[PDB]
């Protein structure tokens, strides 16, 4: 076969998981929405893709959403142009979506399971106060002026608070752009330009993990150089003593103590912005998703990757600056209509034990997180999770990047203890919402394998130097897609020519995801990494994914990263980042023999052309917060180039450039 | 032996009880009324309106009062704890449309208002058409202004009919206003102006009100001198005489009117947009805050059922568009029911005391609504003025503000209705939007002084004042609660949420507070006696204003009174009375020290030995507001010797009261 | 012996009524027409729309013919007196949607402009899909500088295709366009732009007509020295020669729209918002049209008045700074989803021959155009004309003034090679669309004769002295309306008692269009000049068409102008200004004998009180750019108050006015 599954310790024959007693129906768990085999599946997507679809998604929209005005239109517009249009001539409001239609059904149901920094902190939001919350302020922005079409910046920490500013947002028709609380100030300043906001939503502090991240303080020292800014609304979170601008800056508990908790809804178009999210090269990309189409995304995805029933408890881990959190934390459970998590801490918080301590607390139906969160966990020891009950959970997510085999097995054995589906997710914050994923009632899965495409998506792989389609099976190139759909981002805020060359110009007809991808035998398709981080060894394609999937498998192994760099024999040769865990003894093993180990099991496995021609122990490897490993930042820096660096200022941990840039001379 | 009294009255009680008269049973050529014939259909249509099951009345009744852009799919949501009341969310409507253009779309020349001016030779009819075409007008104005969909406007405005024009102009592009009653000082102008944030004004050059002149864009240009968001002031042209106008920002409105053409297009409001802003007559202005649909159906009902209004009918209001009352049952009551409204520029007693009457006979009015003191005012000028006119067009006469004593009720009765007119006592407040408790007037038989029972959709309940618990049965007196919202509840107070909560929703929790004590005498019908902060405590006794009030006028030669408590020793409280009697009384004639006797006898025969006041004052009037409501929080204050924390006081009907008030003390 | 007779011709009347011809009688594989074949076919059809029973027909013509957001309840309301006509109050619509998305929705590639640039080799079809584009990024760039519903936004572009995206992405936000013809003086454009208040204006670097260059930006900068209200220019990069740009307050079009996505939402607007305000060529006039009624009117006289089907290609060659531009070239022509023609040169541009190779080039259906360019290319010679096809066409329009019958003949016999209707279209900006014409397929016309009113036009002759209605038939006087139409202007913008003084005011109970008129014995109806114009000689009252058509008649003659001037005699005497052909010798030919010829024209088909006290040769006349001959400043001149002319810079040509004003003295 050309195409071969990620590197992992378990044989190929041994290595397909079909859903699980728990998504069958059985032991009381309910029956799975689409099932029970990969043809029901096929079945329903066939149903969502190509010239006939469009009767499946205009029942879909209005049996799933509830809409002021009725659309003609089911879709218009397409890639070469960026003129995207879904329901063009209907009308909604996200937040009646959310909120009012299930406070009016059931008010006392719980909306948001606050799971705050201290455990102890803890407690359930109903929709009632969410939507009380979520009016108050809304009446407080529109005391500020805020208009229809404004966009809103909002700097808030993981408090439960922060989906009562998104949706208070949505409820006027502004425009919010979330930045991850403790970004720099020289961040989060030119993402509050750049989306021309003029009020902004922030906290005195947050608390993450024990750690104070000092919000106002980096709040202060970016609006000194945003002019359009003009009012400032702090939550009150830890009440330590902030700095307070008279005039601009006001408590949002004193300003919503002014307003009632009632806001009228204001009656979008469904092609109407619903928010700016800026991705974390050059300047900020602000990706630009309108209302209907995303929010009917969010929903389908929710109910059918995770199989939600209205009962269930679902915890995404993320975090809202991330479109995770936006559309796995607030926009698709709030719709649907159920719990939803809010997780204020980290996965080691008070001690590793976190996410499992709060799964059988709370009874958690859904376990949505990042590899790089599992592969934090699978160091920390099985002591944490293997004595803890967790049978509430159907379903475990991953998201974010390549899943390990080795990462998936261990989620897979421990947190789901053999009995639950695993849903890994492949998407973009320019798709929306989830792109490839397993049905989990339907899909039998395979370690770090996405499976199939989601309803709406028909996915292509494209060879990157003919340009033209790869028909069947056992191929491999750059991911596209043929057609638009619902949830697909509509523009990157003012800058549309910079959409348009991203994702349209480079396969015209079809959008260019920007991953590398291949389709086995069985038709899986798997997503091995960035276009960019491909490394070309004597011309061999190398992906990221396999040669850090081939080094995990060696004992002591925590994480990895592989870049390339310029040969003068192979063209590009692999240089490899390894993280050992901290009990590894580099006195006991030689360094110089713990290289020599990892580039054997990396020939063995992929072959002699996969060989790291140099290998660098690190303690941590260069991360955003969203986990996300940055290749690029090492590739520059093998090359030489560690001047020529972007803006690394709120990267996970700063310093570790520092010591990357040290062990490489 | 009750524990629960009727207002003292003359009349004894076995006498006292008042059948709906001929004119409200459909007799001699009468409309038929829409609820009748006796208390039972009263009840039997209440019963639909509150309770698990009303929502299908409510439902029905809104999408038959109201003209909709957008239907509404839900009924009603929120409570008072938050203060998060939803009626007909995602409904969209316009007030100006449901009080203007569907009426002038089916009859363009029927009488929107009739505008009795300030001189009777001046009053004409304005017709539908007219009236819709000036509110156009106006809110082109305004939007060529900037104004937009939740900005607010200050009006100030007097009863001249071009008022509607400038509310139903806000109304219909969506803006908020805020009108104060023209008369009021700079300073109460100023706080009203500044709490609202205007950036736009509209006023008059001057008003006319009872032949003497109202130098409104004096007090205009006064107040503005501490207002600096206002940029535009509208100024109509009332009386032409010269005064100032500062150049860019006043601006004359037939001038700005004429530029405009005579429609404009209506904005699409959600149920729950806001109406408008009233600040009411304590501390800072109180600016009471209306959403839209909940309270023009409630208007509009009331309307139709309290005051039985048939589409031919001639509406008469006599109050200020500056009230509550104005609000609902001048401008936005009758306009949505789609009859003739009465807009009266004058004073009841101007050229004469027949003014009222004149115009009654003159226009047919079929119904009048007025407050205790023009009655009051009417009754110590001497039935010459009233005995000799026709007055049998009216069918319904009401009476609204404050308790009615039982001698100014049959004094009512008897002159203005002949015997042969429903006398409706309407008990509500700028907070309710809407009558709360009131007789219908072809189905209760209604006592001197009760406002009966309450309307539809207020469930209400009488409350120990300390224990929060609900009195059951009848003959139980304490304070007045509502159980549940009602479609025209005030929503907020502007920028003053947590005032709002504090005031009317935390004091009792789980219920809606209104501040006025309350009794359910034997027969069940409820008696409204005055506030709570006026209760007085004679070792024990709770004793209501009201009834100590009419009690006093039972005695010949007395105008008008207001009782106050003051601290004692011996009881806790005591007694006093401030006294007006009528300027014909002869004052040497009968010794002071023996009226007061008499009085305190009258008190005693009619009360009980503990209600008769320790000292009685004599005064010319009593401090009052411009509606008529009597300041006993003024006068308590200064007998407490507190003169010096009485507060804003310069924009009361006779501020020079006070001085007389403070004298005659010490 | 009838008091009205026709227009003066060289025909005889017996010989003067053409029947629709074969090419409208549904014969030679044309459509068949709407409405015929014969007269009463149309009575029967009007007779629907006026009267106490018309609701009916006008409120299923709305639904039918345009798309609403919202329905309406009520049909009409309002009237004359007070100037609060109504139409389909309630409804709710956008007219960017009519003209744009609903035809692109159905078929994305049709032409929507036949873009006739003035080169004819650079030349091209523009689709839907690309209009509609360009008009969402406009509109966005619009909303991207704080333009809202409401606002107004001038517009002083010239005749090229983006002009249509300009007014469209103005009426798909729900601002207020006014547009200015490009070419006006700097005074001319500023007195504009400060009356309609806006704080937007869209132009050119510079417009190219007839091989010249209009320096459209030169002249927005030095109108904009005194237009304080205006923030922000767009500039529209015709040309490419360099002009000036003012930081900040300029940017360019290509590059604002270059930002901006594809799509924009239509903002729902009610029908009575309004869409335009547009001056007439004292103080500058800005008539108001509302949505719903004036788009409806368009769409129906387009398709009536025309014959317009679903294939045709519609050349009005009129420019868009002329309400003839705004309602037959933009708003009907879309609004049908047809194909319609922006002529961006002149008639004689290279060559007199270019209108009828730009016919035979596209294959227009129809071709629409004033008197004056009929005149113009009558008196470049036959050669230019007689050897096209021009087969294509079947309808011939003319606008804008009366046609005299040599005209007509002219137009009839060579652009229609007598296989043509003609469609002599009588109205006014203020009436919104054609009020008096004949269907093509329906009506036998007569030279020179507007013959029978439109669909829901109740119009009638009132005697001016009287103030009352004439019955009957061979009347003459002053031209009314009885009722409000559709379409009719709603105001004068922010003069609304100028609205009402000059068409409510004059004859209570009517609207006075300002022209004289007659219906002959045969129920024609007959439009033969402004009332401003009529010459009373000894009691004897003359219009200018019967004076103007006689001379023509003459040999050599091009173009003629009549005005009055006090008279001790006769209380006026008529003076004639008469253009011959540039090709007639003065020298050989005395001009005194051909003055005694032309006035015994005059005598011989009108009568002695008609004869010219004095005429006057002159190269050209005094014209609008819309072609209306400036009769009024003929007369202030014959008066000799050649001073108090008022502003007269942006006349078409400006320096005839000093020859006229030479050859008087
Ligand atoms: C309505 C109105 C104007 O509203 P507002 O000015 O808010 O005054 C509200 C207060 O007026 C008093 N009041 C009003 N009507 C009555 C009545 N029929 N019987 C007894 N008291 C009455 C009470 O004290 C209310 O709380
Ligand atoms: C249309 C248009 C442009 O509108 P506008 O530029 O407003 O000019 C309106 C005036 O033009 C004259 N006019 C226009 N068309 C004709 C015609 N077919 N026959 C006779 N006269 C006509 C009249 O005097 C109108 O009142």
């Known amino acids: 076969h050309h195409v071969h599954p990620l590197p992992d310790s378990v044989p190929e024959s041994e290595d397909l998981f079909a859903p699980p007693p728990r998504m069958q129906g059985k032991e009381g768990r309910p029956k799975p929405h689409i099932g029970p085999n990969y043809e029901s599946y096929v079945k329903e997507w066939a149903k969502t893709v190509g010239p006939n679809s469009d009767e499946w998604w205009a029942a879909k929209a209005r049996e799933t959403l509830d809409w002021y005005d009725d659309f003609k239109t089911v879709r218009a517009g397409g890639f070469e142009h960026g003129d995207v249009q879904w329901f063009p001539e209907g009308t909604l409001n996200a937040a009646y979506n959310c909120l009012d239609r299930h406070y009016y059904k059931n008010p006392k149901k719980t909306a948001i399971i606050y799971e705050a920094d201290e455990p102890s902190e803890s407690r359930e939001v109903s929709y009632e106060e969410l939507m009380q919350e979520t009016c108050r302020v809304a009446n407080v922005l529109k005391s500020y002026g805020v208009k229809k079409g404004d966009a809103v910046s909002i700097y808030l920490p993981m408090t439960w ?27 989060l300043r030119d993402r509050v330009n750049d989306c021309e906001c003029k009020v902004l939503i922030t906290t005195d502090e947050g608390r993450r993990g024990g750690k104070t991240i000092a919000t106002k303080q980096i709040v202060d ?18 009440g330590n003593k902030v700095p307070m601008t008279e005039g601009r800056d006001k408590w949002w508990d004193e300003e919503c103590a002014k307003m009632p908790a009632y806001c009228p809804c204001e009656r979008m178009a469904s092609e109407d912005p619903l928010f700016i999210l800026y991705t974390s090269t050059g300047k900020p990309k602000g990706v630009v998703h309108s209302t209907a189409g995303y929010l009917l995304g969010t929903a389908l995805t929710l109910k059918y990757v995770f199989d939600a029933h209205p009962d269930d408890r679902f915890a995404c881990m993320a975090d809202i600056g991330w479109i995770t959190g936006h559309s796995y934390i607030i926009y698709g459970p709030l719709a649907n209509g159920i719990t939803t998590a809010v997780f204020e801490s980290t996965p080691v918080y008070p001690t590793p034990s976190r996410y499992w301590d709060f799964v059988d607390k709370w ?4 376990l949505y997180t990042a590899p790089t969160a599992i592969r934090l966990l699978r160091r920390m020891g099985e002591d944490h999770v293997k004595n803890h009950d967790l049978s ?15 990462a998936w097995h261990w989620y897979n054995d421990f947190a789901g203890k053999n009995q639950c589906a695993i849903v890994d997710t492949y998407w973009m914050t320019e798709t929306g919402s989830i792109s490839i994923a397993p049905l989990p009632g339907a899909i039998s899965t395979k370690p770090g394998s996405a499976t199939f495409p989601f309803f709406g998506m028909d996915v292509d792989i494209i060879d990157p130097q003919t340009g033209q389609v790869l028909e069947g099976n056992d191929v491999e190139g750059v991911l596209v897609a043929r057609r638009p759909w619902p949830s697909i981002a509509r523009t990157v805020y003012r800058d549309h020519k910079r959409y348009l060359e991203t994702y349209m110009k480079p396969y015209p007809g079809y959008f260019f995801f920007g991953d590398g991808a291949a389709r086995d035998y069985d038709g899986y398709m798997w997503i091995k990494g960035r276009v960019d981080d491909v490394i070309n060894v004597s011309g061999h394609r190398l992906s990221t994914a396999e040669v850090e999937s081939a080094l995990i498998l060696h004992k002591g192994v925590a994480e990895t990263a592989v870049v390339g760099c310029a040969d003068d024999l192979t063209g590009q040769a692999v240089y490899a980042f390894v993280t050992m865990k901290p009990e590894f003894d580099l006195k006991a093993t030689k360094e110089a023999d713990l290289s020599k180990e990892l580039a054997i099991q990396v020939r063995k496995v992929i072959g002699p052309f996969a060989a790291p021609k140099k290998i660098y122990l690190v303690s941590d490897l260069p991360k955003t ?39 490489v001379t």
Not at 224 to 235: F, I, K
Not at 392 to 406: D, H
Request: glycine share 8%; proline share 4%.
């Open 625 to 663: 917060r969203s986990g996300k490993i940055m290749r690029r930042v090492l590739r520059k820096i093998v090359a030489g180039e560690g001047d020529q660096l972007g803006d690394l200022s709120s990267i996970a941990d700063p310093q570790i450039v520092e010591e990357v840039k040290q062990k």
């Open 221 to 238: 020292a970016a609006l000194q150089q945003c002019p359009l800014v003009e009012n400032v609304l702090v939550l009150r979170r830890t």
């Open 392 to 406: 509430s959970l159907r379903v475990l997510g991953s998201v974010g990047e390549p899943i390990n085999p080795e």
């Open 363 to 366: 009874k958690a139906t859904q």
């Open 161 to 187: 608070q922060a989906a009562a500013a998104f949706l208070a947002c949505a409820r006027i028709g502004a425009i919010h752009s979330a930045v991850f609380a403790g970004f720099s100030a020289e961040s």
